[PDB]
Amino acid sequence: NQSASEQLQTDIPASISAMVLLNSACQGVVETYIDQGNAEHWYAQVEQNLNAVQKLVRQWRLSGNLYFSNDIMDSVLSIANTFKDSNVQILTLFKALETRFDTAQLQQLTSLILTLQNPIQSLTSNIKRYDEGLNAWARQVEDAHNTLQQTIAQIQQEEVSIQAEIIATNAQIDLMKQQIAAFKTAIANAQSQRKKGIFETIFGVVLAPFTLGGSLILAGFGVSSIVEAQSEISSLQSDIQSSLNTINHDQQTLSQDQQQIASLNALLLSVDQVNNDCAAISRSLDTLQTTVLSLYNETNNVVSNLTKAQDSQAVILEQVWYQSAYNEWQDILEVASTLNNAQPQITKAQIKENLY
Amino acid sequence: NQSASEQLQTDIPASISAMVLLNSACQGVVETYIDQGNAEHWYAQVEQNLNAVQKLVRQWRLSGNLYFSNDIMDSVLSIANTFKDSNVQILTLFKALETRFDTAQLQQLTSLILTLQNPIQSLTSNIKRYDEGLNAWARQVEDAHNTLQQTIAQIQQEEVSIQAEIIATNAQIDLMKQQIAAFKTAIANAQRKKGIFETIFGVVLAPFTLGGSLILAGFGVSSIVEAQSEISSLQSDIQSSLNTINHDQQTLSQDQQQIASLNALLLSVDQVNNDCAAISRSLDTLQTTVLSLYNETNNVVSNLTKAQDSQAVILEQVWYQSAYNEWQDILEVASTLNNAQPQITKAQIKENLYF
Ligand SMILES: [Cl-]
Numbered sequence: 001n002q003s004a005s006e007q008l009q010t011d012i013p014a015s016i017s018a019m020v021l022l023n024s025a026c027q028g029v030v031e032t033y034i035d036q037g038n039a040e041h042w043y044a045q046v047e048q049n050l051n052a053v054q055k056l057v058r059q060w061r062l063s064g065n066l067y068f069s070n071d072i073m074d075s076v077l078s079i080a081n082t083f084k085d086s087n088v089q090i091l092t093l094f095k096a097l098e099t100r101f102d103t104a105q106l107q108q109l110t111s112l113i114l115t116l117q118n119p120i121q122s123l124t125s126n127i128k129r130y131d132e133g134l135n136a137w138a139r140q141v142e143d144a145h146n147t148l149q150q151t152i153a154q155i156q157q158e159e160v161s162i163q164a165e166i167i168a169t170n171a172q173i174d175l176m177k178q179q180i181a182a183f184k185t186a187i188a189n190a191q192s193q194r195k196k197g198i199f200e201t202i203f204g205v206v207l208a209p210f211t212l213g214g215s216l217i218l219a220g221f222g223v224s225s226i227v228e229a230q231s232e233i234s235s236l237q238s239d240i241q242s243s244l245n246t247i248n249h250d251q252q253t254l255s256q257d258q259q260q261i262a263s264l265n266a267l268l269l270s271v272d273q274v275n276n277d278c279a280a281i282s283r284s285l286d287t288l289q290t291t292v293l294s295l296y297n298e299t300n301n302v303v304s305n306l307t308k309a310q311d312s313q314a315v316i317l318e319q320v321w322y323q324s325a326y327n328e329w330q331d332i333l334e335v336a337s338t339l340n341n342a343q344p345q346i347t348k349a350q351i352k353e354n355l356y
Numbered sequence: 357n358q359s360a361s362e363q364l365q366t367d368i369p370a371s372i373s374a375m376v377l378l379n380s381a382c383q384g385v386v387e388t389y390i391d392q393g394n395a396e397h398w399y400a401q402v403e404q405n406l407n408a409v410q411k412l413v414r415q416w417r418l419s420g421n422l423y424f425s426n427d428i429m430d431s432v433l434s435i436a437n438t439f440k441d442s443n444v445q446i447l448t449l450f451k452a453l454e455t456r457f458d459t460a461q462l463q464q465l466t467s468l469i470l471t472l473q474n475p476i477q478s479l480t481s482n483i484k485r486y487d488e489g490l491n492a493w494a495r496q497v498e499d500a501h502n503t504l505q506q507t508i509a510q511i512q513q514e515e516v517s518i519q520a521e522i523i524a525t526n527a528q529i530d531l532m533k534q535q536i537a538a539f540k541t542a543i544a545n546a547q548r549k550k551g552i553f554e555t556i557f558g559v560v561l562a563p564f565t566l567g568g569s570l571i572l573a574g575f576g577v578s579s580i581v582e583a584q585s586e587i588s589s590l591q592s593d594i595q596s597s598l599n600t601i602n603h604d605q606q607t608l609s610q611d612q613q614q615i616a617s618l619n620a621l622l623l624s625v626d627q628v629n630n631d632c633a634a635i636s637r638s639l640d641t642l643q644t645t646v647l648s649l650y651n652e653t654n655n656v657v658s659n660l661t662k663a664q665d666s667q668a669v670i671l672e673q674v675w676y677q678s679a680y681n682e683w684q685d686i687l688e689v690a691s692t693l694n695n696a697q698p699q700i701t702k703a704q705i706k707e708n709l710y711f
């Protein structure tokens with residue numbers, strides 16, 4: 001139903017969106033803080049495990065990863081600019097060949113179409129290279145997540161006297177994960193409708209609070225979008241606020257020391273977003289790779305048809321594919337350029353007890 | 357000549373501005389990253405010293421300190437809302453007392469003025485408590501800074517064959533400190549619609565040829581007024597200093613660049629130290645002005661008590677009306693800052709001449 005270039009209009013920003021989300025999730029991990037307070041010796045293992053996750057995120061940043069893959073973005077722009085720089089020449093040849101067929105100009109037209117294949121293959125190579133490095137890192141983050149999750153589960157299983165409050169708290173943290181997923185789905189549905197940019201919101205959820213201010217836990221997570229999304233991010237903040245209010249109600253019978261134990265799985269919110277965002281990137285790059293290959297095959301079929309053309313009628317029927325692809329790649333150039341030149345707009349939202 | 361409320365129109369946002377700067381300096385500390393690479397045994401001590409500074413920042417934030425003191429802000433809003441809610445009552449009593457001197461109405465007006473004193477004293481108390489906690493924390497950060505600085509100094513002393521490159525690098529790091537100071541000076545000069553605007557810089561040092569680096573040295577600046585021209589000049593300044601560092605380190609291996617660049621780790625810790633001192637200076641000014649306002653209310657309540665004719669009461673209305681007008685502006689500025697969501701940008705500063 002769609003040409004490859006038409007599909008890429010969706011698949012390219014979909015992949016950039018997934019990468020931007022990972023960047024914001026990484027920031028959420030960095031901005032997750034805990035203090036020992038009066039906690040028993042279990043705290044050392046939680047601190048160690050959390051620091052291991054944070055070390056992986058710092059190494060990802062130190063390796064140069066920011067909002068999206070520069071190599072993939074540059075390859076997209078290379079294809080788009082190859083279309084842009086050859087359009088007048090290609091249309092002039094089509095019109096000349098429409099008037100009078102001659103093999104020399106047909107050979108020149110075929111050579112111009114062929115100049116697309118190197119930038120396309122470069123995009124495929126850079127997607128593969130990026131996804132391999134991403135997956136190698138993601139496996140380490142997943143292992144670090146599982147270790148922290150197991151450490152916390154062991155601690156909470158030993159607190160037999162407050163099991164009901166721990167279960168109720170963990171249900172609210174699961175709801176928060178659902179609310180975050182609902183935000184991402186809402187954004188994805190409205191991406192094609194709005195102007196492009198880089199927008200990030202880092203949340204901090206205050207748990208086990210002190211009366212006079214501050215807390216023992218500041219549980220972070222990060223979300224983002226490549227389109228303005230003030231309404232959706234406000235609904236998410238309202239959702240997380242509601243869930244935190246319910247946690248505070250469910251923990252009303254707990255001391256601050258018990259709240260510290262009962263709230264530990266909020267530390268997984270940040271790294272869970274990293275895990276989910278890594279998987280989303282890889283799914284989007286599998287889709288993108290299939291579509292890029294489809295575009296490569298289209299150019300091969302067009303070149304094959306042009307080489308077989310013996311009259312003007314056979315040459316000009318390839319013009320519809322070209323004109324359609326050029327129009328799509330002109331739009332891809334605008335979107336990719338906007339994202340590549342955008343100044344990221346970041347904000348922070350601290351979520352704490354709302355009702356007193 | 358300025359009334360205390362007129363002075364507070366400047367002194368209150370001045371203190372808020374100083375607090376917002378400290379948050380951005382703290383963010384720069386948190387976003388300073390190093391990896392060991394092939395570094396020798398000195399790396400453990402640098403990493404431990406840096407982690408000690410970063411732990412202090414995390415503890416400061418876990419104590420509830422973000423962009424500004426919530427206790428001080430809420431006390432400012434408490435005074436402003438006391439003026440707002442009492443205004444119509446006070447103005448009508450002044451008007452009736454003007455027409456005909458009434459003893460009962462005078463005591464009511466006096467009691468309405470006295471209601472200002474409780475929130476004013478709570479502001480003084482909340483300034484003292486915050487500043488005491490700030491100074492206690494700032495002494496820990498200063499001690500942590502000096503330890504990391506001494507560790508770096510000793511490491512750089514032992515690399516005898518590349519002293520020229522280390523001295524040149526440290527000179528440019530000092531230049532960056534002056535360039536940051538120039539931004540904050542320009543901000544203190546230029547008074548538009550308020551907000552919370554923050555920029556976090558990351559300076560790439562000892563880079564890998566294919567991307568990334570062993571050092572990402574952070575620092576942060578901020579303002580409560582938009583300052584796009586000022587932050588653009590700062591970025592251009594920092595970019596030029598980093599380009600000079602890369603030129604001056606061209607003879608160094610990546611391992612040597614790692615050592616030669618270590619003092620960049622002190623950039624945002626140094627900003628924390630400077631910003632803590634600047635907050636305390638602004639809080640001493642603020643506390644003096646708030647005490648001046650408290651004494652103004654004591655002079656007015658005594659004048660209302662000593663008053664025995666109508667003209668003596670209207671004499672105190674000029675103070676009230678002037679105070680109220682200033683505090684309605686303060687309510688608008690404080691509400692804008694208390695309700696603001698931070699507008700944060702980030703800039704990575706790396707070699708930008710080749711590509
Ligand atoms: Cl656009």
Ligand SMILES: [K+]
Binds near residue numbers: 251252253255256
């Ligand atoms: K409780």
